[PDB]
Amino acid sequence: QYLLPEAKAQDSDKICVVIDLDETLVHSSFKPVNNADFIIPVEIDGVVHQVYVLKRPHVDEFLQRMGELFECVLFTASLAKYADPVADLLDKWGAFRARLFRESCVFHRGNYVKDLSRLGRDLRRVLILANSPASYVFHPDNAVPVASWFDNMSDTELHDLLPFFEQLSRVDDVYSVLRQ
């Protein structure tokens, strides 16, 4: 069985974009951060720890627009119990049509790989936005790299990628732009 159901009517003409959470859209820590965007309590072996979450600058604009341009899918190497609460707070617009977590990755040579082949979408119309090439070793021709983000409040990578996405949203075959 594929990782996604069939695309709903309003999504099936669109390109599918698989989006990484950590160091791509947000950055989370167990070290207390003053003036955090969100704090989520995560239970680990019966004990609750606070996870301090910072949003990358421009992520609201980015997410809002990507959910129009694309069938967006959150595909994180992290675990639902941290990633669901975070996505609930982040995704104000219903941008993420599905959420896929650690179990849905393939652990390959010490790396959590998003294997786009198990999605159930024609690979000519799938993109992956990820801060590490390890994320997409199987699909390097589907990828749009973005630098890892931690706390640099002057970052504008998400803002500056939007026009490129704006363009990719409209092609028929992403390989015609990325090359395969």
Q: Binding residues for Mg ion, per CB under 5 A?
A: 20, 22-24, 131
**To the nearest whole angstrom, how small is the minimum distance from the Cβ of residue 170 to Mg ion?**
27
- Smallest CA-to-CA distance from 25 within 154, 175, 146, 116 is with 146
For residue 20, say whether it is annotated as part of any ligand binding site.
yes
Instruction: Specify whether the CB–CB gap between 73 and 130 falls below 8 A.
Output: no
For residue 131, say whether it is annotated as part of any ligand binding site.
yes
Catalytic choice (13, 22, 155, 173): 22
Catalytic choice (11, 13, 20, 91): 20
Residue 98 or 134: which CB sits closer to Mg ion?
Answer: 134
Residue 152 or 175: which CB sits closer to Mg ion?
Answer: 152
**To the nearest whole angstrom, how small is the minimum distance from the Cβ of residue 122 to Mg ion?**
25
Length of the chain: 180
- Indicate if 22 belongs to the active site: yes
Query: 59-69 and 157-168 helices cross at what angle (nearest 10)?
Result: 10
Say which DSSP state 35 is in. T
Instruction: Specify whether the CB–CB gap between 116 and 165 falls below 8 A.
Output: no
For residue 152, say whether it is annotated as part of any ligand binding site.
no
Annotated catalytic residues are: 20, 22
Annotated binding site: 20, 22, 131
